[PDB]
Design a protein around this ligand. Structure first.
Ligand SMILES: C[C@@]1(c2ccc(-c3nc4ccccc4c(=O)[nH]3)cc2)NC(=O)NC1=O
Ligand SMILES: [Zn+2]
Length: 208
């Protein structure tokens, strides 16, 4: 049931998604090991992901969360990197998309920094890099991220350097507590609390 609609680069919606992608790049404490060395991306395509059933599954869960949290879904737009983006956009998020060993427990993880989600496009720690060159810093191969609508509801705040969310909460917020430049990361424990709204195809760019 999924169809993908291409956005034109002249569309303000393409432009606002591209800007969130580019402006949330940061340096990583691994010096680029997982995700590659880059300061910006070459955006190749942005497609809107349209699936009525997945959308309705999302909004149904959003209303439940909202009603458990003084009518506040606490909805964000966040990045997700995964080897399974193609399954996600067709079938939705479920437990096979979870990071069992994540620092905040077995759930599905999202980032404010696009460059953080980039480190997972080829797997945990960037795996063995791109399929074609086995290069975690490949500048040639096309990568994809999702820019997702995520319901956080009442989020458990963890300060720091599938399971259940903590009792009385709908998600966990991993607040960065050492690296002053890192943005927050978030975990949900129900696939129905995220909708994969944009599929972004891109290359990382070699710095000049
Ligand atoms: C499905 C998978 C997976 C997928 C995505 C991520 C992921 N982890 C994150 C952790 C922090 C912030 C963003 C992300 C993010 O965008 N993606 C971690 C593990 N779990 C797994 O064991 N291997 C995987 O590739
Ligand atoms: Zn490659």
């Amino acid at each position: 049931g999924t169809i993908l609609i291409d956005l034109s680069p002249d569309d303000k919606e393409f432009q606002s998604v591209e800007e969130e992608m580019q402006s949330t790049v940061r340096e990583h404490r691994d010096g680029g090991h997982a995700g590659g060395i880059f300061n910006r991306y070459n955006i190749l395509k942005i497609q809107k992901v349209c699936n009525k059933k997945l959308w309705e599954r999302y909004t149904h869960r959003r209303k439940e969360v909202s009603e458990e949290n003084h009518n506040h879904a606490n909805e964000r737009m966040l990045f997700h990197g995964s080897p399974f983006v193609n399954a996600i956009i067709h079938k939705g998020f479920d437990e096979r998309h979870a990071y069992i060993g994540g620092m905040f427990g077995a759930g599905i993880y999202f980032a404010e920094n696009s460059s953080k989600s980039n480190q997972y496009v080829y797997g945990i720690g960037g795996g063995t890099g791109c399929p074609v060159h086995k290069d975690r810093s490949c500048y040639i191969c096309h990568r994809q991220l999702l820019f997702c609508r995520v319901t956080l509801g009442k989020s458990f705040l963890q300060f720091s350097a599938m399971a259940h969310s903590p009792p009385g909460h709908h998600s966990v917020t991993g607040r960065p507590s050492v690296n002053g430049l890192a943005l927050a990361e978030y975990v949900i424990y129900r696939g129905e609390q995220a909708y994969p709204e944009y599929l972004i195809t891109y290359q990382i760019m070699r710095p000049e």
